[PDB]
Every structure is written in C-alpha cells, then in structure tokens.
XYZ file of C-alpha atoms in Angstrom:
440
model
C 0.000 0.000 0.000
C 2.966 2.357 0.576
C 6.358 2.374 -1.187
C 9.235 4.617 -0.109
C 10.839 6.096 -3.238
C 13.481 8.285 -1.595
C 14.643 9.158 1.911
C 16.265 12.544 1.547
C 17.788 15.225 3.758
C 17.165 18.880 2.894
C 19.417 21.690 4.159
C 19.595 25.432 3.461
C 21.687 26.298 0.363
C 25.503 26.320 0.771
C 26.983 29.518 2.290
C 23.649 30.986 3.476
C 23.285 30.106 7.165
C 25.807 29.820 9.963
C 25.199 28.310 13.407
C 22.136 29.952 14.997
C 20.163 29.585 18.209
C 16.699 30.704 19.249
C 15.913 31.267 22.900
C 12.560 30.039 24.177
C 9.844 31.396 26.510
C 7.395 29.869 28.998
C 4.892 29.724 26.089
C 7.304 27.305 24.374
C 8.379 25.458 27.542
C 4.711 24.552 28.163
C 5.016 22.090 25.232
C 8.267 20.374 26.304
C 6.684 16.926 26.772
C 4.007 17.139 24.054
C 3.464 14.477 21.347
C 4.198 15.369 17.692
C 1.697 17.322 15.608
C 0.755 15.614 12.301
C -0.980 17.370 9.428
C -1.896 16.345 5.906
C -2.587 18.406 2.796
C -4.180 16.443 -0.047
C -4.009 17.726 -3.638
C -5.813 16.479 -6.742
C -3.790 16.450 -9.993
C -3.287 13.915 -12.838
C 0.388 13.366 -11.910
C 2.395 10.410 -13.309
C 5.238 8.569 -11.577
C 7.710 9.926 -14.133
C 6.586 13.539 -13.719
C 6.628 13.198 -9.896
C 10.294 12.101 -10.083
C 11.225 14.604 -12.785
C 9.864 17.856 -11.322
C 7.957 17.391 -8.030
C 10.817 15.730 -6.103
C 13.450 18.311 -7.166
C 10.957 21.201 -6.710
C 10.074 20.113 -3.141
C 13.770 19.841 -2.228
C 14.800 23.120 -3.901
C 11.876 25.208 -2.619
C 12.178 23.834 0.917
C 15.955 24.412 0.896
C 15.459 28.078 -0.035
C 12.657 28.495 2.573
C 14.923 27.071 5.316
C 17.465 29.881 4.935
C 14.703 32.263 6.139
C 13.241 29.885 8.729
C 16.300 28.497 10.542
C 14.482 26.919 13.531
C 12.586 24.590 11.144
C 15.931 22.913 10.315
C 17.139 23.139 13.932
C 16.703 20.869 16.946
C 15.175 21.283 20.391
C 18.053 21.039 22.843
C 17.347 20.059 26.464
C 20.090 20.153 29.120
C 20.034 18.110 32.384
C 21.061 21.096 34.535
C 18.035 22.975 36.037
C 19.893 26.192 35.153
C 20.546 25.942 31.389
C 17.203 26.480 29.622
C 16.148 24.457 26.577
C 16.729 26.249 23.284
C 16.458 25.676 19.564
C 19.860 25.165 17.915
C 20.719 25.059 14.232
C 24.265 23.917 13.388
C 25.801 23.835 9.894
C 25.152 20.336 8.548
C 21.653 20.043 10.086
C 18.909 18.939 7.707
C 15.201 18.240 7.435
C 14.135 14.635 6.772
C 12.021 14.581 3.622
C 10.477 11.271 2.595
C 9.117 10.714 -0.900
C 6.690 7.854 -1.240
C 4.060 6.263 -3.427
C 0.637 5.121 -2.187
C -1.547 2.689 -4.092
C -4.764 3.428 -2.170
C -7.457 5.268 -4.137
C -7.039 8.965 -3.312
C -10.817 9.384 -3.552
C -11.116 6.927 -0.615
C -9.138 9.362 1.585
C -10.153 12.904 0.617
C -13.902 12.620 1.342
C -15.724 13.633 4.545
C -17.440 10.372 5.438
C -15.985 7.827 7.905
C -12.623 6.399 6.747
C -10.264 4.253 8.837
C -8.009 6.481 10.927
C -5.073 4.109 10.444
C -5.066 4.570 6.643
C -3.503 8.018 7.212
C -0.560 6.988 9.420
C 1.854 5.967 6.672
C 1.266 9.369 4.990
C 2.744 11.366 7.889
C 6.470 11.300 8.653
C 7.889 10.342 12.032
C 9.292 13.359 13.861
C 12.703 11.636 13.846
C 15.147 10.011 16.263
C 16.700 12.160 18.987
C 20.457 12.678 19.281
C 21.795 11.929 22.751
C 25.072 13.653 23.601
C 27.170 13.893 26.783
C 25.670 17.260 27.812
C 22.185 17.224 26.184
C 19.470 15.546 24.097
C 18.562 16.975 20.666
C 15.116 16.443 19.135
C 14.107 17.152 15.501
C 11.482 19.883 15.147
C 10.051 19.388 11.633
C 9.796 16.599 9.038
C 8.007 16.104 5.713
C 6.532 13.302 3.618
C 5.470 13.857 0.017
C 3.318 10.951 -1.241
C 2.391 10.269 -4.863
C -0.997 8.751 -5.647
C -0.238 7.837 -9.265
C -2.478 9.652 -11.748
C -4.565 11.064 -8.888
C -2.578 13.527 -6.766
C -0.137 14.262 -3.976
C -0.346 14.328 -0.185
C 2.052 16.460 1.818
C 2.430 15.256 5.412
C 4.033 17.663 7.880
C 5.090 16.581 11.366
C 6.374 19.041 13.958
C 7.220 19.478 17.604
C 4.946 22.032 19.300
C 8.062 23.729 20.814
C 8.976 24.921 17.293
C 5.987 27.268 17.370
C 2.225 27.542 17.219
C -0.238 27.396 14.338
C 0.559 31.042 13.426
C 4.270 30.180 13.149
C 3.469 27.166 10.930
C 1.180 29.348 8.781
C 3.941 31.951 8.324
C 6.395 29.221 7.259
C 3.946 27.574 4.859
C 3.054 30.919 3.247
C 6.766 31.389 2.528
C 7.419 27.864 1.312
C 4.423 27.853 -1.047
C 5.375 31.288 -2.449
C 8.919 30.075 -3.078
C 7.641 26.857 -4.719
C 4.961 28.601 -6.842
C 7.404 31.148 -8.225
C 9.769 28.428 -9.486
C 12.042 27.938 -6.458
C 12.667 31.643 -6.027
C 12.459 33.822 -2.881
C 12.420 37.157 -4.770
C 8.629 37.453 -4.332
C 8.727 36.359 -0.669
C 11.464 38.874 0.199
C 9.632 41.731 -1.542
C 6.010 40.982 -0.587
C 5.929 38.214 2.045
C 5.761 38.260 5.838
C 9.203 37.564 7.303
C 9.490 35.837 10.705
C 10.418 38.019 13.677
C 13.025 36.297 15.843
C 13.379 39.175 18.328
C 12.851 37.854 21.850
C 10.130 40.344 22.811
C 8.445 38.098 25.412
C 10.708 38.360 28.468
C 9.275 36.877 31.674
C 12.135 34.855 33.197
C 10.253 33.922 36.387
C 7.431 32.375 34.348
C 10.067 30.619 32.209
C 11.450 28.825 35.263
C 8.006 28.006 36.673
C 6.872 26.384 33.405
C 10.043 24.280 33.110
C 9.470 22.901 36.622
C 5.927 21.841 35.659
C 7.354 20.157 32.539
C 9.917 18.298 34.717
C 13.144 19.217 32.900
C 15.805 17.351 35.000
C 14.201 14.002 34.101
C 13.364 14.935 30.483
C 16.363 13.156 28.942
C 15.575 9.983 30.962
C 11.834 10.227 30.198
C 11.784 11.209 26.512
C 10.422 8.530 24.176
C 9.139 8.611 20.573
C 5.353 8.798 20.078
C 4.612 7.823 16.469
C 1.119 6.755 15.380
C 0.714 3.152 14.207
C -2.144 0.806 13.335
C -4.027 -1.383 13.162
C -7.087 0.357 14.654
C -10.896 0.115 14.474
C -11.232 3.900 14.708
C -12.866 5.992 11.994
C -12.183 9.534 10.861
C -14.936 11.831 9.614
C -15.300 15.522 8.798
C -18.444 17.371 9.919
C -19.482 20.602 8.221
C -21.132 23.558 9.906
C -22.077 25.994 7.130
C -22.260 29.773 7.650
C -26.062 29.542 7.296
C -26.404 26.828 9.964
C -23.954 28.672 12.261
C -25.976 31.890 11.957
C -29.225 30.023 12.764
C -27.580 28.411 15.795
C -26.173 31.808 16.843
C -29.620 33.420 16.515
C -31.072 30.729 18.822
C -28.395 31.476 21.468
C -28.879 35.247 21.242
C -32.688 34.870 21.476
C -32.664 32.563 24.504
C -29.701 34.193 26.269
C -29.934 37.896 25.288
C -27.344 39.117 27.824
C -24.677 36.437 27.181
C -21.510 38.548 26.874
C -19.673 36.437 24.306
C -21.133 34.664 21.270
C -19.103 33.934 18.118
C -19.239 31.572 15.130
C -16.462 29.620 16.841
C -18.139 29.328 20.270
C -21.415 28.255 18.615
C -19.590 25.583 16.576
C -17.821 24.376 19.721
C -21.120 24.340 21.624
C -22.844 22.257 18.956
C -20.052 19.652 18.695
C -19.834 19.685 22.480
C -23.548 18.783 22.687
C -23.043 15.987 20.116
C -20.121 14.542 22.099
C -22.278 14.629 25.253
C -25.121 12.726 23.500
C -22.640 10.241 21.978
C -20.894 9.490 25.263
C -23.941 9.425 27.587
C -21.394 9.742 30.403
C -21.265 11.814 33.630
C -19.051 14.904 33.519
C -17.301 16.575 30.616
C -14.540 19.094 29.960
C -14.214 20.925 26.649
C -11.409 23.320 25.811
C -9.555 25.110 23.040
C -6.448 27.232 22.322
C -6.371 31.024 21.961
C -3.799 32.954 19.921
C -2.633 35.527 22.492
C -0.455 37.764 20.252
C -2.909 40.655 19.695
C -4.163 40.392 23.284
C -0.721 40.815 24.893
C 0.197 44.041 26.718
C 1.742 45.428 24.586
C 0.519 43.476 21.489
C 2.842 40.910 19.885
C 3.276 41.236 16.090
C 1.632 38.432 14.063
C 5.026 37.483 12.611
C 6.577 36.789 16.056
C 8.257 33.394 15.730
C 7.378 30.796 18.342
C 4.482 29.966 20.642
C 2.083 32.578 21.960
C -0.937 30.487 22.883
C -3.465 30.513 25.711
C -6.407 28.271 26.476
C -9.952 28.227 27.768
C -12.050 25.352 29.080
C -15.530 24.626 30.432
C -16.871 21.773 32.562
C -20.478 20.569 32.708
C -22.500 17.547 33.703
C -23.312 15.496 30.599
C -27.097 15.555 31.214
C -26.979 19.368 30.959
C -25.283 19.237 27.522
C -27.717 16.979 25.639
C -30.337 18.181 23.113
C -31.494 21.628 22.021
C -31.320 22.967 25.579
C -27.900 21.308 25.929
C -26.472 23.252 22.993
C -27.712 26.496 24.581
C -26.130 25.553 27.930
C -22.866 24.664 26.155
C -22.800 28.020 24.349
C -23.412 29.805 27.654
C -20.595 28.046 29.519
C -18.101 28.463 26.656
C -19.128 32.133 26.249
C -18.881 32.905 29.977
C -15.503 31.174 30.370
C -14.014 32.716 27.236
C -15.201 36.177 28.291
C -13.488 35.677 31.666
C -10.284 34.432 29.982
C -10.122 37.377 27.541
C -10.771 39.894 30.345
C -7.813 38.383 32.227
C -5.624 38.906 29.128
C -6.746 42.567 28.985
C -5.727 42.875 32.653
C -2.316 41.498 31.616
C -2.647 38.150 33.408
C -0.074 35.822 31.817
C -0.376 32.654 33.931
C -3.157 30.094 33.294
C -5.900 18.149 41.412
C -8.597 20.820 41.283
C -10.343 18.004 39.398
C -9.719 15.350 42.074
C -11.621 17.546 44.562
C -14.333 19.033 42.336
C -14.986 15.912 40.234
C -13.109 13.876 37.625
C -14.391 14.344 34.054
C -15.402 11.120 32.285
C -14.718 12.824 28.905
C -12.243 15.558 27.983
C -11.987 17.181 24.548
C -9.380 19.736 23.462
C -9.747 21.528 20.113
C -6.885 21.508 17.624
C -7.114 24.332 15.105
C -7.528 28.028 14.483
C -10.187 28.703 11.809
C -8.785 32.217 11.257
C -5.663 30.767 9.604
C -6.429 29.625 6.071
C -4.337 26.492 5.636
C -6.826 25.593 2.866
C -5.118 28.317 0.730
C -1.685 26.658 0.749
C -0.730 26.253 -2.924
C 2.637 24.767 -3.954
C 1.867 25.222 -7.661
C -0.788 22.518 -8.196
C -3.747 24.441 -6.788
C -5.331 24.674 -3.341
C -5.745 21.535 -1.180
C -8.691 19.229 -1.767
C -8.663 18.128 1.887
C -6.823 18.854 5.146
C -6.516 16.342 8.019
C -4.982 16.749 11.487
C -3.927 13.158 12.031
C -2.549 13.770 15.553
C -6.073 14.151 17.072
C -6.079 10.304 17.086
C -3.648 10.250 20.094
C -5.939 11.721 22.748
C -9.063 13.716 23.669
C -9.045 16.039 20.675
C -11.022 17.210 17.625
C -9.956 19.577 14.819
C -11.825 22.764 13.865
C -10.779 24.679 10.749
C -12.247 26.853 8.013
C -13.296 25.256 4.707
C -12.085 26.399 1.308
C -15.120 26.754 -0.876
C -16.008 29.079 2.042
C -13.953 30.689 4.826
C -17.213 31.257 6.742
C -17.973 27.530 6.986
C -16.348 25.239 9.569
C -14.915 21.715 9.190
C -14.770 19.571 12.334
C -12.512 16.488 12.285
C -13.259 13.531 14.593
C -11.511 10.171 15.027
C -13.420 7.740 17.239
C -14.101 3.995 17.495
C -16.253 2.437 14.760
C -19.049 1.547 17.209
C -19.364 5.181 18.325
C -19.089 6.747 14.850
C -22.399 5.408 13.486
C -24.369 7.049 16.317
C -22.234 10.207 16.243
C -23.037 10.783 12.555
C -26.785 10.449 13.222
C -26.489 12.679 16.308
C -24.726 15.435 14.339
C -26.928 15.276 11.200
C -30.280 14.740 12.989
C -29.608 17.592 15.396
C -29.283 20.030 12.515
C-alpha cells in the first residue's frame, strides 16, 4: 500500500546560514513533553510517476531548501540540558537537515479525501515520524520538523508535515507555509517572498524569566532526557475519521437561537457556537457523567503590549468549560454549552486585557469522564496553501487520534464555513453521525 521512493535530507543552500540559536519562553516550555503534531494536505492532480520524479521531487527539495534559509528553527533541533539552570533552546548547526520522505501510495485517493468515515489508520503511513533524537554527553537533541510527500499515481499528492509544538504555534506554521508555497509557486525563487511576504520576527520580545522557570518545573526538565520517548502513530485500529461541516447559514441560525434565549450572554461567536454544537453531540454520543471541553487562543494581539503576528514561536493561551453530561444533551444542551463556553471565554479574555499571563482541582471538584481539546484556528487559512498545483482538496490533522481532541478549521469553498474532524471507534461513529446530522 505504501512504497518509499526516496529518503532525503534537505538543508539550506551552501553559504547561506551559519550556526544559529533561538531562545525560548514559557509559552514554548509549556510544550516540552508534548506528542508530535501531524498534518496532511491532499491535492488532486493527474500526476504520473515519471513527472513526480522529474519535477515534483526536485521542486520540493529546492523550494524547501530556499525556505529554510529564512526559517532556521525549522531545520534546527530542540536542545534540552540536564542542569536545572541551562534552559532548553532551539539550535541550528551547519550540517543540520530536514528529513524529507518521498513515497508512493496505491490506495485510491478518492477513498481518503472525502468527509465520510474512513479508517483512521489509513492516514498513518502518509505522515512522517518526527525523527530520532540525538543523545550527547551534555544534552538531548530532538528534531522539530519533518516532511513526507506521497504520490498517488495519476490522482494527486499528499504532503504530510510533522512538527514538535516547541517549534511554534499554528501562526508560526502558517507563516512558514506561506513562505514555502510562495517560493515553490514562483519556481524555487524567494524574490517574491522577500519583496512581498511576511518575514518571521526572531526578536525575543516576550521576556518573563520567572514564568520561564516556573513552566520548566511543571514540565519536569531534570528528568526529560531519561523520560523522553518517541510517540509515532501506528495501526491497526478500528477507529474511523470523519469531517463534519457547519455551514455559515447553519452557524448563523444556531447563533440566533443562542442570542434569542440568552440575550445578555456577553460572548457569542461563530467559533463558540460551533464548539457548543459539537460539544452537545459529544455529550449525546458518550452518555457519560461529567465533561470538559477546551480550546487554544492565539494571544499575540491580546498581549500588553501586542505581539506582532510574525513573532516566531508559541504565543498560545487556552480556555475550558466543565459541565454535567445531562446538561449538555439536546437543544437545551447546545444552549447551555454556548453559555458556559461564552462565559468562560469572556473571563479568559478579560484576564488577558488585565495582563494576566499565567493560566488536582479536578480530584476535589470531580473527575471528568470525557475531555476534549480543540486543535485548530479557523482564522488561519491552511486551505489556501498552494505549492503550484492548486489549493488543497482536503486537510486532516492526524494527531487528534492520540488523545481527547477534535480539529476545527475553516473550509475552502467558504472561509465562513467550519470543518470539524473527529476520530473515534467504529461503534461510536455510526451514532455520532446520526447525532450530528439529525440535530441540525
């Protein structure tokens, strides 16, 4: 089903980059022990094996190489030292490279790019492993970014991107991908990027050393080297992956229902309404006791003073709500969900305005029987990423399979519509589909 054509290593062009480091913040240290992030971009095009070898392979290598000279941390490694003093950092050293795998897949591409339930494990051999760590006398070094480009002969191409969350957040990945695609589209040339594109800002403008040290303690840094193990996804599995669509029209109707029933609810957005609806579906599907639902927040614009969009690295916050499952079910359940999300998000955003940077409560108050954390930021249009073959047919966040997570992103026939990705056991999928569709 999968054939590896080439295992390559891609570096910046000769005589372009010297040794370079990037210092990290508490926002980055938060993710020290996180599993890899895996994303797929699927493209439809009538591409032959010969053409893939002749132009695609060299074009991927060349365009990535050129992009790396502007995005040094992508070709660097996370370096963790055993001493509680020396902070982890990103280091690039001359000779460092990005692992780029070229492969061929004999599965029907049309059996992967749809929205209906497909086996989760069919996607695993399309995403690259993050890569083996390097263990030295004074440190461990972990790769930050890897790529797989997979040919589906006469059908298209999937680009699988795996990264460590310490490299940066979704905004950082978006910035990088905008550059890479520009460079690829313009025939392996950074002239357009340098003139018109958004360059990464490596200035260390987030300086809170006391928070830095507090976050490293929580992430247990002295045992990191001893504890670190690879976390690649592998089958077989009975789980199914589906994509659920909330159209602008449906979202507005749901929003109108919330605003009508709860006229003084301080925060109601397309995103909170989408979250509330999926939240209610998950509650109905699980028929459990107590649930937590949460999601990330890009904090850049909310910082005091504001952080430029192009700031390189992590600048992410989070918000969560907890409710008894019986309160989340049905039409009234969706309303309750929207209320709790809205209230908690309003509180969180007020705290950011006040300049609040920080943030077994559960053991005391009650252990959730389900927890869901959203992957995704619908504001970032990953569906516009065009390497020269057109925009993606389908995006998948494969790493939601690891734990209590769903993906929420914009669509590309419409940036006002939302796509929700779910990977759950086959037995639960059948009901979930009916729950979602019937409820609308």
